[PDB]
Short mmCIF file of C-alpha atoms in Angstrom, two decimals:
data_model
loop_
_atom_site.label_atom_id
_atom_site.label_comp_id
_atom_site.label_asym_id
_atom_site.label_seq_id
_atom_site.Cartn_x
_atom_site.Cartn_y
_atom_site.Cartn_z
CA UNK A 17 -29.44 -2.13 7.95
CA UNK A 18 -27.61 -1.60 11.26
CA UNK A 19 -28.65 -3.05 14.64
CA UNK A 20 -27.43 -2.58 18.22
CA UNK A 21 -26.52 -5.94 19.77
CA UNK A 22 -26.58 -6.50 23.53
CA UNK A 23 -26.51 -9.93 25.12
CA UNK A 24 -24.55 -12.21 27.44
CA UNK A 25 -22.54 -15.22 26.34
CA UNK A 26 -20.13 -17.43 28.30
CA UNK A 27 -20.21 -15.08 31.31
CA UNK A 28 -19.42 -11.83 29.43
CA UNK A 29 -21.56 -8.94 28.13
CA UNK A 30 -21.33 -8.54 24.34
CA UNK A 31 -22.43 -5.23 22.86
CA UNK A 32 -21.88 -3.31 19.66
CA UNK A 33 -23.24 -2.26 16.29
CA UNK A 34 -23.81 -4.78 13.50
CA UNK A 35 -24.10 -3.54 9.90
CA UNK A 36 -25.45 -6.12 7.45
CA UNK A 37 -25.26 -6.09 3.63
CA UNK A 38 -28.43 -5.88 1.55
CA UNK A 39 -29.09 -9.56 0.74
CA UNK A 40 -25.36 -10.47 0.35
CA UNK A 41 -24.34 -13.37 2.63
CA UNK A 42 -20.79 -12.14 2.96
CA UNK A 43 -17.69 -12.40 5.15
CA UNK A 44 -17.58 -10.74 8.58
CA UNK A 45 -15.27 -7.92 9.64
CA UNK A 46 -14.79 -7.03 13.30
CA UNK A 47 -14.18 -3.25 13.56
CA UNK A 48 -12.45 -1.95 16.69
CA UNK A 49 -12.95 1.64 17.88
CA UNK A 50 -10.36 4.27 18.81
CA UNK A 51 -9.74 5.46 22.39
CA UNK A 52 -12.96 7.54 22.32
CA UNK A 53 -15.08 4.36 22.40
CA UNK A 54 -17.94 3.20 20.16
CA UNK A 55 -18.90 6.54 18.63
CA UNK A 56 -20.89 7.41 15.45
CA UNK A 57 -17.81 7.53 13.19
CA UNK A 58 -17.08 3.85 13.91
CA UNK A 59 -20.68 2.85 13.17
CA UNK A 60 -20.36 4.78 9.88
CA UNK A 61 -17.28 2.70 9.01
CA UNK A 62 -19.31 -0.45 9.71
CA UNK A 63 -22.02 0.85 7.34
CA UNK A 64 -19.39 1.49 4.65
CA UNK A 65 -18.16 -2.11 4.96
CA UNK A 66 -21.73 -3.39 4.66
CA UNK A 67 -22.20 -1.43 1.42
CA UNK A 68 -19.18 -3.35 0.04
CA UNK A 69 -20.83 -6.70 0.88
CA UNK A 70 -19.42 -7.44 4.40
CA UNK A 71 -21.13 -7.94 7.72
CA UNK A 72 -19.33 -5.52 10.05
CA UNK A 73 -19.44 -5.63 13.83
CA UNK A 74 -18.30 -2.54 15.67
CA UNK A 75 -17.68 -4.18 19.02
CA UNK A 76 -17.84 -2.07 22.18
CA UNK A 77 -14.80 -2.79 24.38
CA UNK A 78 -15.62 0.03 26.85
CA UNK A 79 -18.90 -1.30 28.35
CA UNK A 80 -20.99 1.62 27.04
CA UNK A 81 -18.55 4.39 28.10
CA UNK A 82 -17.24 7.05 25.65
CA UNK A 83 -14.84 10.00 25.98
CA UNK A 84 -14.64 13.41 24.27
CA UNK A 85 -11.19 14.44 25.56
CA UNK A 86 -7.70 12.79 25.72
CA UNK A 87 -7.50 12.56 29.50
CA UNK A 88 -10.71 10.54 29.96
CA UNK A 89 -10.04 8.60 26.72
CA UNK A 90 -6.53 7.70 27.93
CA UNK A 91 -7.97 6.40 31.23
CA UNK A 92 -10.52 4.21 29.42
CA UNK A 93 -7.80 2.86 27.11
CA UNK A 94 -5.32 2.18 29.96
CA UNK A 95 -8.08 0.34 31.87
CA UNK A 96 -8.95 -1.75 28.78
CA UNK A 97 -5.34 -2.67 27.90
CA UNK A 98 -3.91 -2.78 31.44
CA UNK A 99 -6.65 -4.22 33.71
CA UNK A 100 -9.49 -5.67 31.55
CA UNK A 101 -7.45 -7.23 28.72
CA UNK A 102 -8.59 -10.81 29.60
CA UNK A 103 -12.19 -9.65 29.58
CA UNK A 104 -11.83 -7.99 26.16
CA UNK A 105 -10.25 -11.22 24.84
CA UNK A 106 -13.29 -13.11 26.16
CA UNK A 107 -15.66 -10.66 24.44
CA UNK A 108 -13.84 -11.13 21.11
CA UNK A 109 -13.95 -14.94 21.51
CA UNK A 110 -17.63 -14.96 22.50
CA UNK A 111 -18.51 -12.64 19.59
CA UNK A 112 -16.77 -14.97 17.12
CA UNK A 113 -18.65 -17.96 18.58
CA UNK A 114 -21.96 -16.08 18.38
CA UNK A 115 -21.50 -15.10 14.74
CA UNK A 116 -20.48 -18.61 13.73
CA UNK A 117 -23.53 -20.05 15.53
CA UNK A 118 -25.73 -17.70 13.45
CA UNK A 119 -23.92 -18.48 10.14
CA UNK A 120 -22.63 -14.89 9.93
CA UNK A 121 -19.36 -14.83 8.02
CA UNK A 122 -19.91 -18.15 6.25
CA UNK A 123 -18.84 -17.73 2.62
CA UNK A 124 -20.57 -20.03 0.13
CA UNK A 125 -17.79 -20.01 -2.45
CA UNK A 126 -15.29 -21.64 -0.04
CA UNK A 127 -17.79 -23.39 2.29
CA UNK A 128 -16.09 -21.88 5.33
CA UNK A 129 -16.06 -18.85 7.65
CA UNK A 130 -14.04 -15.83 6.57
CA UNK A 131 -13.55 -13.32 9.35
CA UNK A 132 -11.42 -10.21 9.19
CA UNK A 133 -10.53 -7.59 11.76
CA UNK A 134 -9.66 -3.91 11.45
CA UNK A 135 -9.39 -1.02 13.89
CA UNK A 136 -8.00 2.44 14.45
CA UNK A 137 -5.55 3.81 17.05
CA UNK A 138 -6.03 1.62 20.16
CA UNK A 139 -8.27 -0.47 17.85
CA UNK A 140 -5.22 -0.97 15.62
CA UNK A 141 -3.24 -2.21 18.64
CA UNK A 142 -6.17 -4.52 19.47
CA UNK A 143 -6.32 -5.79 15.85
CA UNK A 144 -2.68 -6.90 16.09
CA UNK A 145 -3.07 -8.25 19.64
CA UNK A 146 -6.27 -10.23 19.07
CA UNK A 147 -5.07 -11.32 15.64
CA UNK A 148 -2.15 -13.03 17.40
CA UNK A 149 -4.21 -14.33 20.35
CA UNK A 150 -6.91 -15.88 18.10
CA UNK A 151 -4.66 -16.87 15.23
CA UNK A 152 -6.91 -19.77 14.10
CA UNK A 153 -9.95 -17.52 13.66
CA UNK A 154 -9.00 -14.63 11.35
CA UNK A 155 -8.34 -14.62 7.58
CA UNK A 156 -7.25 -10.96 7.28
CA UNK A 157 -6.07 -8.14 9.60
CA UNK A 158 -6.04 -4.42 8.84
CA UNK A 159 -4.65 -2.45 11.83
CA UNK A 160 -4.57 1.33 11.37
CA UNK A 161 -1.88 3.29 13.28
CA UNK A 162 -1.79 1.20 16.41
CA UNK A 163 0.95 1.53 19.03
CA UNK A 164 3.29 -1.44 19.41
CA UNK A 165 4.55 -0.34 22.85
CA UNK A 166 1.31 -0.71 24.89
CA UNK A 167 0.73 -4.47 24.85
CA UNK A 168 3.01 -7.32 23.67
CA UNK A 169 2.06 -8.20 20.12
CA UNK A 170 3.07 -11.78 19.49
CA UNK A 171 4.24 -11.58 15.89
CA UNK A 172 5.36 -15.23 16.02
CA UNK A 173 1.74 -16.35 16.47
CA UNK A 174 0.09 -14.38 13.62
CA UNK A 175 -1.27 -16.60 10.83
CA UNK A 176 -3.40 -14.12 8.86
CA UNK A 177 -2.20 -11.69 6.15
CA UNK A 178 -1.88 -8.13 7.51
CA UNK A 179 -2.37 -4.69 5.92
CA UNK A 180 -0.78 -2.34 8.48
CA UNK A 181 -1.52 1.36 7.85
CA UNK A 182 0.69 4.05 9.38
CA UNK A 183 1.01 7.83 9.29
CA UNK A 184 4.35 9.40 8.35
CA UNK A 185 4.04 12.22 10.94
CA UNK A 186 2.30 10.21 13.66
CA UNK A 187 2.86 11.98 17.01
CA UNK A 188 2.11 8.73 18.94
CA UNK A 189 3.85 6.08 16.77
CA UNK A 190 7.48 6.89 15.83
CA UNK A 191 8.70 5.46 12.53
CA UNK A 192 11.32 3.52 14.53
CA UNK A 193 8.45 1.52 16.07
CA UNK A 194 7.03 0.72 12.62
CA UNK A 195 10.52 -0.46 11.54
CA UNK A 196 10.71 -2.80 14.57
CA UNK A 197 7.35 -4.34 13.66
CA UNK A 198 8.54 -4.88 10.07
CA UNK A 199 11.66 -6.67 11.36
CA UNK A 200 9.53 -8.94 13.57
CA UNK A 201 7.30 -9.80 10.59
CA UNK A 202 10.42 -10.55 8.52
CA UNK A 203 11.75 -12.77 11.30
CA UNK A 204 8.57 -14.84 11.79
CA UNK A 205 7.37 -15.01 8.18
CA UNK A 206 4.25 -12.89 8.75
CA UNK A 207 2.61 -11.82 5.47
CA UNK A 208 2.37 -8.18 6.53
CA UNK A 209 2.35 -5.25 4.14
CA UNK A 210 3.11 -1.91 5.78
CA UNK A 211 1.67 1.21 4.16
CA UNK A 212 3.17 4.48 5.37
CA UNK A 213 1.56 7.72 4.17
CA UNK A 214 3.95 10.69 4.14
CA UNK A 215 2.96 13.94 5.79
CA UNK A 216 -0.24 12.92 7.64
CA UNK A 217 -0.93 12.51 11.36
CA UNK A 218 -2.45 9.83 13.53
CA UNK A 219 -6.18 9.29 12.82
CA UNK A 220 -6.06 10.73 9.29
CA UNK A 221 -8.89 8.34 8.30
CA UNK A 222 -11.32 10.01 10.74
CA UNK A 223 -13.48 12.28 8.60
CA UNK A 224 -15.12 13.74 11.74
CA UNK A 225 -11.79 15.21 12.96
CA UNK A 226 -10.81 18.12 10.63
CA UNK A 227 -7.55 18.76 12.50
CA UNK A 228 -6.13 15.39 11.34
CA UNK A 229 -8.36 14.11 8.51
CA UNK A 230 -6.71 13.82 5.11
CA UNK A 231 -9.20 13.24 2.29
CA UNK A 232 -6.72 12.20 -0.43
CA UNK A 233 -5.11 9.46 1.68
CA UNK A 234 -8.40 8.42 3.38
CA UNK A 235 -9.85 7.73 -0.05
CA UNK A 236 -6.66 5.96 -1.15
CA UNK A 237 -6.40 3.75 1.95
CA UNK A 238 -10.09 2.79 1.82
CA UNK A 239 -9.61 1.55 -1.77
CA UNK A 240 -6.58 -0.49 -0.72
CA UNK A 241 -8.33 -1.87 2.37
CA UNK A 242 -11.48 -3.00 0.54
CA UNK A 243 -9.33 -4.64 -2.17
CA UNK A 244 -7.31 -6.48 0.50
CA UNK A 245 -10.39 -7.63 2.48
CA UNK A 246 -12.08 -8.79 -0.72
CA UNK A 247 -8.97 -10.67 -1.82
CA UNK A 248 -8.64 -12.62 1.44
CA UNK A 249 -12.26 -12.91 2.67
CA UNK A 250 -14.42 -13.55 -0.48
CA UNK B 239 2.54 -6.59 -30.43
CA UNK B 240 4.58 -3.48 -29.54
CA UNK B 241 7.04 -1.45 -31.63
CA UNK B 242 10.79 -0.90 -31.28
CA UNK B 243 11.31 2.88 -31.49
CA UNK B 244 14.64 4.28 -32.64
CA UNK B 245 15.30 7.89 -33.52
CA UNK B 246 17.46 10.89 -32.70
CA UNK B 247 16.20 14.09 -31.07
CA UNK B 248 18.02 17.11 -29.58
CA UNK B 249 21.44 15.49 -29.92
CA UNK B 250 20.60 12.14 -28.25
CA UNK B 251 19.67 8.71 -29.61
CA UNK B 252 16.35 7.42 -28.25
CA UNK B 253 15.46 3.75 -28.32
CA UNK B 254 12.96 1.51 -26.57
CA UNK B 255 9.80 -0.56 -26.77
CA UNK B 256 6.35 1.03 -27.11
CA UNK B 257 3.25 -0.98 -26.15
CA UNK B 258 -0.08 0.55 -27.24
CA UNK B 259 -3.57 -0.19 -25.85
CA UNK B 260 -6.29 -1.48 -28.20
CA UNK B 261 -9.63 0.34 -28.45
CA UNK B 262 -8.66 3.09 -25.96
CA UNK B 263 -6.55 6.27 -26.20
CA UNK B 264 -5.03 6.83 -22.81
CA UNK B 265 -2.23 8.06 -20.55
CA UNK B 266 1.43 7.17 -21.02
CA UNK B 267 3.70 5.35 -18.58
CA UNK B 268 7.48 5.38 -18.93
CA UNK B 269 8.89 2.05 -17.66
CA UNK B 270 12.55 1.96 -16.59
CA UNK B 271 14.52 -1.30 -16.63
CA UNK B 272 16.64 -2.90 -13.91
CA UNK B 273 20.44 -3.20 -14.10
CA UNK B 274 20.21 -5.98 -16.73
CA UNK B 275 19.02 -3.47 -19.36
CA UNK B 276 16.00 -3.54 -21.69
CA UNK B 277 15.31 -7.27 -21.55
CA UNK B 278 12.14 -9.28 -22.39
CA UNK B 279 10.74 -9.06 -18.84
CA UNK B 280 10.56 -5.25 -19.10
CA UNK B 281 8.85 -5.39 -22.51
CA UNK B 282 6.36 -7.82 -20.91
CA UNK B 283 5.64 -5.24 -18.19
CA UNK B 284 4.99 -2.68 -20.93
CA UNK B 285 2.55 -5.09 -22.60
CA UNK B 286 0.78 -5.59 -19.24
CA UNK B 287 0.34 -1.83 -18.86
CA UNK B 288 -1.10 -1.63 -22.38
CA UNK B 289 -3.66 -4.35 -21.53
CA UNK B 290 -4.82 -2.04 -18.70
CA UNK B 291 -5.35 0.88 -21.09
CA UNK B 292 -1.97 2.70 -20.96
CA UNK B 293 0.64 3.46 -23.57
CA UNK B 294 3.87 2.11 -22.06
CA UNK B 295 7.38 3.00 -23.22
CA UNK B 296 10.20 0.81 -22.00
CA UNK B 297 13.08 3.21 -22.58
CA UNK B 298 16.58 1.84 -23.15
CA UNK B 299 19.10 3.74 -21.00
CA UNK B 300 22.00 1.38 -21.82
CA UNK B 301 22.50 2.15 -25.56
CA UNK B 302 21.54 -1.38 -26.69
CA UNK B 303 23.68 -3.22 -24.08
CA UNK B 304 22.28 -5.91 -21.74
CA UNK B 305 23.89 -8.04 -19.00
CA UNK B 306 23.17 -11.57 -17.73
CA UNK B 307 25.42 -11.45 -14.63
CA UNK B 308 25.88 -9.02 -11.67
CA UNK B 309 29.44 -7.97 -12.52
CA UNK B 310 28.65 -6.69 -16.03
CA UNK B 311 25.25 -5.37 -14.89
CA UNK B 312 26.88 -3.43 -12.03
CA UNK B 313 29.35 -1.81 -14.44
CA UNK B 314 26.59 -0.73 -16.86
CA UNK B 315 24.57 0.70 -13.93
CA UNK B 316 27.53 2.63 -12.42
CA UNK B 317 28.29 4.09 -15.87
CA UNK B 318 24.62 5.13 -16.34
CA UNK B 319 24.25 6.73 -12.90
CA UNK B 320 27.73 8.33 -12.90
CA UNK B 321 29.32 9.19 -16.23
CA UNK B 322 26.16 9.27 -18.37
CA UNK B 323 23.50 10.71 -16.04
CA UNK B 324 23.17 13.97 -18.06
CA UNK B 325 22.74 11.95 -21.24
CA UNK B 326 20.04 9.75 -19.64
CA UNK B 327 18.24 12.90 -18.46
CA UNK B 328 18.31 14.20 -22.02
CA UNK B 329 16.92 10.91 -23.32
CA UNK B 330 14.01 11.11 -20.86
CA UNK B 331 13.28 14.71 -21.84
CA UNK B 332 13.51 13.97 -25.58
CA UNK B 333 11.20 10.95 -25.17
CA UNK B 334 8.60 13.11 -23.42
CA UNK B 335 8.83 15.72 -26.18
CA UNK B 336 8.47 13.06 -28.87
CA UNK B 337 5.34 11.57 -27.31
CA UNK B 338 3.70 14.96 -26.81
CA UNK B 339 4.43 15.92 -30.43
CA UNK B 340 2.64 12.70 -31.50
CA UNK B 341 -0.34 13.21 -29.11
CA UNK B 342 0.64 10.15 -27.07
CA UNK B 343 -0.49 10.50 -23.44
CA UNK B 344 -3.15 13.16 -24.11
CA UNK B 345 -6.20 12.41 -21.94
CA UNK B 346 -9.50 13.78 -23.25
CA UNK B 347 -11.26 13.98 -19.87
CA UNK B 348 -8.72 16.53 -18.55
CA UNK B 349 -7.66 18.04 -21.90
CA UNK B 350 -4.00 17.55 -21.04
CA UNK B 351 -1.10 15.10 -21.04
CA UNK B 352 -0.93 12.56 -18.23
CA UNK B 353 2.41 10.82 -18.02
CA UNK B 354 3.50 8.42 -15.31
CA UNK B 355 6.83 6.75 -14.63
CA UNK B 356 7.74 3.46 -12.95
CA UNK B 357 10.84 1.31 -12.75
CA UNK B 358 12.60 -1.44 -10.88
CA UNK B 359 15.92 -1.55 -9.01
CA UNK B 360 18.16 1.02 -10.79
CA UNK B 361 14.94 1.95 -12.65
CA UNK B 362 13.36 2.73 -9.26
CA UNK B 363 16.25 5.05 -8.45
CA UNK B 364 15.80 6.65 -11.90
CA UNK B 365 12.02 7.04 -11.35
CA UNK B 366 12.70 9.09 -8.19
CA UNK B 367 15.57 11.03 -9.74
CA UNK B 368 13.91 11.91 -13.06
CA UNK B 369 10.58 12.46 -11.29
CA UNK B 370 12.27 15.26 -9.36
CA UNK B 371 14.35 16.57 -12.27
CA UNK B 372 11.33 16.82 -14.60
CA UNK B 373 8.86 17.75 -11.88
CA UNK B 374 6.28 19.42 -14.11
CA UNK B 375 6.09 16.59 -16.67
CA UNK B 376 4.94 13.66 -14.52
CA UNK B 377 1.56 13.09 -12.87
CA UNK B 378 2.39 9.82 -11.04
CA UNK B 379 5.57 8.00 -9.96
CA UNK B 380 5.88 4.35 -8.94
CA UNK B 381 9.53 3.51 -8.01
CA UNK B 382 10.16 -0.11 -7.04
CA UNK B 383 13.04 -0.88 -4.64
CA UNK B 384 15.53 1.68 -5.81
CA UNK B 385 18.61 2.79 -3.87
CA UNK B 386 18.53 6.33 -2.45
CA UNK B 387 22.31 6.60 -1.88
CA UNK B 388 23.54 6.37 -5.52
CA UNK B 389 22.26 9.66 -6.91
CA UNK B 390 20.97 12.74 -5.00
CA UNK B 391 17.19 12.72 -5.30
CA UNK B 392 15.81 16.24 -5.02
CA UNK B 393 12.81 15.50 -2.83
CA UNK B 394 12.02 19.22 -2.57
CA UNK B 395 11.27 19.35 -6.31
CA UNK B 396 8.85 16.40 -6.60
CA UNK B 397 5.30 17.50 -7.51
CA UNK B 398 3.75 14.15 -8.48
CA UNK B 399 2.22 11.63 -6.06
CA UNK B 400 4.54 8.68 -5.42
CA UNK B 401 3.87 4.99 -4.78
CA UNK B 402 7.22 3.74 -3.43
CA UNK B 403 7.43 -0.07 -3.24
CA UNK B 404 10.03 -1.73 -1.02
CA UNK B 405 10.98 -5.24 0.00
CA UNK B 406 11.23 -6.00 3.74
CA UNK B 407 14.32 -8.25 3.31
CA UNK B 408 16.01 -6.27 0.57
CA UNK B 409 19.73 -7.13 0.64
CA UNK B 410 20.59 -3.91 -1.29
CA UNK B 411 18.24 -1.33 0.30
CA UNK B 412 18.31 -1.34 4.13
CA UNK B 413 15.06 -0.33 5.83
CA UNK B 414 17.01 2.58 7.42
CA UNK B 415 17.37 4.03 3.90
CA UNK B 416 13.60 3.71 3.35
CA UNK B 417 13.02 5.55 6.63
CA UNK B 418 15.32 8.41 5.52
CA UNK B 419 13.31 8.76 2.30
CA UNK B 420 10.05 8.86 4.32
CA UNK B 421 11.48 11.65 6.50
CA UNK B 422 12.52 13.64 3.40
CA UNK B 423 9.01 13.27 1.97
CA UNK B 424 7.54 14.39 5.31
CA UNK B 425 9.89 17.40 5.36
CA UNK B 426 9.15 18.62 1.81
CA UNK B 427 5.45 17.76 1.59
CA UNK B 428 5.84 15.00 -1.03
CA UNK B 429 2.64 12.95 -1.44
CA UNK B 430 4.51 9.65 -1.16
CA UNK B 431 3.01 6.40 0.06
CA UNK B 432 5.57 3.78 1.01
CA UNK B 433 4.56 0.14 0.73
CA UNK B 434 6.88 -2.31 2.46
CA UNK B 435 6.25 -6.02 1.91
CA UNK B 436 7.55 -8.19 4.75
CA UNK B 437 9.62 -11.27 4.03
CA UNK B 438 10.44 -10.69 0.33
CA UNK B 439 13.69 -9.84 -1.45
CA UNK B 440 14.81 -7.23 -3.94
CA UNK B 441 13.23 -7.76 -7.40
CA UNK B 442 10.29 -9.80 -6.05
CA UNK B 443 8.13 -8.51 -8.95
CA UNK B 444 10.38 -10.18 -11.56
CA UNK B 445 8.52 -13.33 -12.58
CA UNK B 446 11.52 -14.41 -14.74
CA UNK B 447 13.78 -14.73 -11.66
CA UNK B 448 12.37 -17.62 -9.56
CA UNK B 449 15.01 -17.18 -6.84
CA UNK B 450 13.44 -13.83 -5.80
CA UNK B 451 9.96 -13.76 -7.40
CA UNK B 452 7.09 -13.77 -4.92
CA UNK B 453 3.77 -14.47 -6.65
CA UNK B 454 1.46 -13.41 -3.78
CA UNK B 455 3.05 -9.96 -3.38
CA UNK B 456 3.68 -9.49 -7.14
CA UNK B 457 -0.04 -9.94 -7.70
CA UNK B 458 -0.87 -7.65 -4.78
CA UNK B 459 1.49 -4.85 -5.82
CA UNK B 460 0.34 -5.01 -9.46
CA UNK B 461 -3.24 -4.39 -8.31
CA UNK B 462 -2.16 -1.47 -6.14
CA UNK B 463 0.02 0.02 -8.87
CA UNK B 464 -2.63 -0.13 -11.61
CA UNK B 465 -5.20 1.42 -9.22
CA UNK B 466 -2.77 4.22 -8.36
CA UNK B 467 -1.84 4.91 -12.00
CA UNK B 468 -5.50 4.92 -13.02
CA UNK B 469 -6.41 7.27 -10.16
CA UNK B 470 -3.79 9.85 -11.08
CA UNK B 471 -3.45 9.47 -14.89
CA UNK B 472 -7.07 9.06 -16.17
#
């Protein structure tokens, strides 16, 4: 089952796609879209999480807007990260509050909420950023190929374990930037594992983009990601 | 319940420890020791592989010698990787030939041999080096925290997928060296995934060395390694 949510809470508009497991009362994963916005591929990822026993909320951070080309997509992303960052923070916070009020993410085995977050591209940046901002709320973070140069990621504040996925030939994220993030995690004692796949580009997980998709590593990284989310959230 | 193999083949003396799975006839993994030599910890690793369905051969590359301190260990390692590298190569090749003659590592599903190789510290270096030297013989490589600057690894020759495990605070392997390896893999089309664990030291997998062992990441990396070896060897 997947449903479109749209409602107001604490003065902000929450919208996105919620995939729910069959019967399983599982953990929750927040899934953050790329710079194109909340498109079908992201909803598909949410469905895939639900088939593994997780509630998955593909939150819309673009207020219903999507882009099909880099120029418009870059404008939406720069607006989100550079002008509406406070608002996006408030949407994340209100979403978390909403799910907890509805018992979504409550895990019987531990008698507590277990909430993860993952995202791709700008959604990877957001995973890091929000994971630091809301460090009491998340039990696992899985940022895929986010930029570290767009917004200040406060590595000192992160409390969750992190699975950080990167592409070896990423045209947007130099390896030097990945190295700097590793050194910050070393410095602050962040339990971050960095996975760097040789020879693939940015967005290699996106099966709808044949110019960058890599099947071998997309299958590999999905296996690793589900294992990691299960380890920390169930 | 493994066996100590000792025999001569093609002019070189082979010795090591062979762990065998029960109730399953599976792939082979060659396991290469650290600079201490073929000590109980390494035999334990072989046993662990056998419990997951693999034959595992902990080859001795030190001609029966072990070391309990860094000075003696460093001398044995420098001798292995300098003066006796050709001999070690011949031991690896003769081992492979021996197993194939005895049907060890033959996998029914693919009607062919599937042989992996893994190792730690100097054994990680060896896994890279021999994986390139004997490029057609290996179907998976899992080098843990080896140095890249001791012997010339021929990245251009590697044909197997690689799971390269590194420690984020490795006192012996700077992250700049890991980056150089990633760039070589990118350049030559090696299917290498690099996994860098923040905050841990060299030899963090070694549960017999409490000063560097890290349980959380040793458990994590074991899971990842078994999944990878199963994916490529069964």
